[PDB]
């Protein structure tokens, strides 16, 4: 107050994030006729979806004949039955419809002989409910899929009159009596604070990949909206589930796509054996994104590493046709030469299992509404929506199937715009906020700007990142996870000892990294505490001590003479985590998985079963 120029803006809807989901929501609201604002710390193009390489999943069936219901089955099979089947229904239903939308927007999709969109093999896909074979349903723009996606989404976004607050760091949500009223954001350009108030708020800030030392994600993937929800007292779903992508360059930790394995890429250990025969003989090296990476990490265990350090594994493209690599995978051909210093068509690529996607996030239904947990039941948080990687409608569940998140972006981003347009009309009076609101966020900014401590922003970041990379790895034991807990918890108390250098208003990257650090910590405590409490092997989260699947029934034997286990005895439930901001204490309760689909007659519910792909 009085120290910072407070400028209040009046809008119908606010969308925080300018990724794939953020954009689709933003102009999708202005399409319905809403006065929409969009808050983003980066420039729209310079988000992350740009880094997307594999492709967008759609059951169009341009290669072979395809049904969208088979795409539903593999998503829920890949989710290890923690995936909410009602949200998976809606996403796989809109799958072909929403991609044809993007092609008509201007996306330069690769083509075949018939002139239709090029679909290609990807990990986890199958025809005829996992009986037919390998399905080709990954629509791609030749290794630069998300790049051209975001540009065409941004291209279309200039058709409508949307107020884009470009390079504005949102700190917290404007919240009053459980009702959402907008966001309080800092302008990066001059340092002035803006209290942007609106009737509806859509959160699409993306994931928190930078919680670990080695990640494929960007420097600006810090899970800010996930921590924004955290501070507001609202829960966060399935945060312990962290996607370890099998194929990531040994050097900087960059991503070479799973589409490499789809075209004909092979994974080879030091001795020469194609190790993806000892583990997954059914679906070769094109198995689930968790099973492949977990097989790689177990190959290092024996001492069969492929380098001078004996730590990484090789991905070979030595046998692939010369022009097939240049046409289908031109982006990886250049990034492997730039970073790893490796010719793709002559040598194998040094790859290692690294952090990729964040399965969890803000609790959400299929409509896009943010859910809270009241009396063991689900309650809609008014005026608050979430979509994309930042959200967790659990359309991915325990394990995300490859190339599904771009669908998750466009489908659920579109859903949020429709859920608002059908909720109210553009012109419904904006709920006024008290003049003292955002006080705890402005004071946090002022306290963090002048912060004189013992350890600096970078020292605490490396302390968190290396600890998460050592403790909450691919394999995790109740011994190391418990040790990692009070190791992370202590670092939250270290936030009082923060050393800042810059005291300027205009572009303080030293301050906003620290703002990112506070946000990264909240998405680090819930990741480690949720993992230590969960005692089973499901999807990405595989326990050494608890190597079994703990469901309501033992689904190996027929379901008849079996007593149903009570809710607090099986781990087939969503891990909802809260945290008191002052002490850093993490308390956690649970939400039941959604099994019933949107329509049983149109799409049948898939019962849990053993999954070794």
């Amino acid at each position: 107050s009085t120290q910072y120029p407070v400028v209040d803006h009046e809008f119908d809807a606010v969308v925080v994030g300018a990724g794939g989901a953020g954009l689709r929501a933003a102009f999708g609201l202005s399409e319905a006729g809403f006065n929409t604002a969009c808050v983003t710390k980066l420039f729209p193009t310079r988000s992350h979806t740009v880094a997307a390489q594999g492709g967008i999943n759609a059951a169009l069936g341009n290669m072979e004949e395809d049904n969208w219901r088979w795409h539903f089955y593999d998503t829920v099979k890949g989710s290890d039955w923690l995936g909410d089947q009602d949200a998976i229904h809606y996403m796989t239903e809109q799958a072909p419809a929403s991609v044809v939308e993007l092609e008509n927007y201007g996306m330069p999709f690769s083509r075949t002989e018939d002139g239709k969109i090029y679909q290609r093999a990807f990990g986890g896909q199958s025809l005829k409910f996992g009986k037919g074979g390998q399905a080709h349903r990954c629509c791609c723009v030749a290794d630069r899929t998300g790049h051209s996606l975001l540009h065409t989404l941004y291209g279309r976004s200039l058709r409508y009159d949307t107020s884009y607050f470009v390079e504005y760091f949102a700190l917290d949500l404007l919240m009053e009596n459980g009702e959402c009223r907008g966001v309080i954001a800092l302008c990066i350009e001059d340092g002035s604070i803006h209290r942007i108030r609106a009737r509806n708020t859509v959160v699409a800030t993306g994931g928190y990949g930078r919680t670990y030392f080695s990640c494929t994600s960007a420097h600006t993937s810090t899970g800010d909206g996930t921590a924004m929800v955290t501070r507001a007292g609202l829960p966060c779903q399935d945060l312990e589930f962290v996607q370890f992508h099998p194929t990531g360059i040994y050097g900087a930790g960059c991503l070479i796509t799973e589409g490499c394995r789809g075209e004909g890429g092979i994974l080879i250990n030091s001795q020469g054996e194609r190790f993806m025969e000892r583990y997954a003989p059914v679906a070769k090296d094109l198995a689930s994104r968790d099973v492949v990476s977990r097989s790689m990490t177990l190959e290092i265990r024996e001492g069969r590493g492929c380098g001078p350090e004996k730590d990484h594994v090789y991905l070979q493209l030595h046998h692939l046709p010369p022009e097939q690599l240049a046409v289908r995978l031109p982006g990886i051909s250049e990034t492997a030469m730039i970073f790893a210093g490796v010719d793709v068509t002559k040598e194998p690529i040094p790859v290692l299992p690294t952090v990729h996607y964040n399965m969890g996030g803000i609790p959400t239904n299929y409509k896009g509404q943010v859910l809270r947990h009241v009396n063991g039941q689900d309650q809609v948080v008014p005026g608050l929506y979430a979509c994309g990687e930042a959200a967790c409608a659990s359309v991915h569940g325990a394990n995300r199937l490859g190339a599904n998140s771009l669908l998750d972006l466009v489908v659920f981003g579109r859903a949020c715009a429709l859920s608002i347009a059908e909720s109210c009309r553009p012109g419904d009076k904006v709920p006024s906020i008290k003049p003292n609101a955002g006080e705890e966020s402005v004071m946090n900014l002022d306290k963090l700007r002048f912060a004189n401590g013992t350890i600096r922003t970078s020292e605490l970041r490396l302390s968190m990142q290396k600890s998460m990379q050592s403790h909450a790895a691919v394999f995790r034991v109740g011994s190391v996870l418990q040790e990692g807990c009070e190791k992370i918890l202590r670092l939250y108390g270290d936030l009082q000892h923060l050393k800042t250098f810059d005291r300027g208003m205009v572009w303080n990257t030293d301050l906003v990294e620290t703002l990112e650090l506070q946000n990264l910590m909240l998405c680090a405590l819930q990741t480690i505490y949720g993992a230590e409490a969960r005692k089973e092997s499901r999807g990405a989260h595989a326990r050494e001590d608890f190597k079994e699947r703990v469901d309501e029934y033992d689904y190996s034997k027929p379901i008849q003479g079996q007593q149903k286990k009570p809710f607090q005895e099986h781990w087939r439930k969503h891990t909802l985590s809260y945290v008191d901001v002052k002490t850093g204490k993490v308390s956690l309760e649970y939400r039941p998985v959604i099994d019933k689909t949107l329509n049983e007659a149109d799409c049948a519910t898939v019962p849990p079963a053993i999954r070794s792909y």
Partner: protein
């Protein structure tokens, strides 16, 4: 130990009448990444956290780390440092742009030019969109190769002398390439009226083929080629 010297452009707007000046930084390359951005991150995270620069993907596809390295506009995460310690690496912001702070240029004009060319697919029958995928042949898809990859890093236009002298009225190679990108696209019908917008001496014709645009591209694209290809379409299009 292998200590490398870095000369970096610095201007702090919160310093009351501060003039822009260079600053030297001492960095050991043994415990440092191969790229310039890794070195910029290192001094940010160790030596001086007052250095303010744009970063994101460290992959060379977002275009945030755009700057002038040793007299050439490239991406910092793509360009690797010269191991020759006898030379000092000079790091400047994108040439002839209003500096906000230390290597951060104001690109509000650059983006607005990209907004003026309308980088979206336009049809005459927009009533039938969003239900049936538009057909495009493999060769018609090849017409977009080496054009759609543009990251909009702005290394392009900022290397052009015409964009220095007339950045206000001249669009620049980055923007002009995208305008061309939406001309040869077989799905776009508004080809003639896209060429109609450039019918003034400044929008397009301020290019004199200096060729500093192509010579500097981080993605290995050829923007100038497209500009001279527009000029051909401009003189030949009927009505």
């Amino acid at each position: 130990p292998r200590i490398k010297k870095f000369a970096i452009y610095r201007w702090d707007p919160d310093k009351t009448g501060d003039k822009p000046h260079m600053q030297t930084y001492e960095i050991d390359l043994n415990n440092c990444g191969p790229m310039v951005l890794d070195a910029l991150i290192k001094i940010k995270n160790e030596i001086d956290s007052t250095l303010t620069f744009r970063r994101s993907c460290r992959e060379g596809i977002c275009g945030s780390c755009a700057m002038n390295i040793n007299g050439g506009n490239t991406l910092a995460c793509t360009r690797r440092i010269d191991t020759n310690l006898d030379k000092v690496s000079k790091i400047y912001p994108l040439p002839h742009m209003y500096v906000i702070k230390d290597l951060v240029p104001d690109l509000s004009n650059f983006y607005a030019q990209y907004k003026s060319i309308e980088p979206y697919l336009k049809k005459k029958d927009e009533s039938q969109e969003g239900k049936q995928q538009y057909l495009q042949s493999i060769e018609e898809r090849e017409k977009l190769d080496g054009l759609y990859e543009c990251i909009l890093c702005a290394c392009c236009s900022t290397s052009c002398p015409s964009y220095w002298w007339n950045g206000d009225k001249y669009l620049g190679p980055a923007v002009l390439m995208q305008a061309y990108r939406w001309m040869i696209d077989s799905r776009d019908d508004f080809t003639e009226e896209r060429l109609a917008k450039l019918q003034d001496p400044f929008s397009l014709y301020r290019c004199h083929t200096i060729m500093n645009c192509t010579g500097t591209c981080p993605k290995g694209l050829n923007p100038g080629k497209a500009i001279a290809e527009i000029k051909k379409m401009m003189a030949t299009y009927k009505e």
